[PDB]
């Protein structure tokens, strides 16, 4: 619980709790605008949104690892 909610909550760029494609492509490489190859980031977020309208809410990523 604590490590996954810490990581996803820094990852949400405030977003009301939701993460989109441009937020992940900016924040992935944590020091400013560092995301170097777009294909690595696009593959990881497309496999982590299971349906969720296309942009990830906090319960999806954590139930995907933590499911209870």
Binding site, annotated residues: 12, 14, 16, 23, 49, 51, 53, 60
| 3-state secondary structure at position 20 | coil
Residues belonging to the binding site for Ca(2+) are: 12, 14, 16, 23, 49, 51, 53, 60
Cα–Cα nearest to 26, from 35, 18, 37: 35
> Which strand (E) or helix (H) includes residue 57?
strand 56-57
């Amino acid at each position: 619980e604590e490590e996954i909610l810490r990581a996803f909550k820094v990852f949400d760029a405030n977003g009301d709790g939701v993460i989109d494609f441009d937020e992940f492509k900016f924040i992935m490489q944590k020091v400013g605008e560092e995301p170097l190859t777009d294909a690595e980031v696009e593959e990881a977020m497309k496999e982590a949104d299971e349906d969720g309208n296309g942009v990830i809410d906090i319960p999806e990523f954590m139930d995907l690892i933590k499911k209870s």
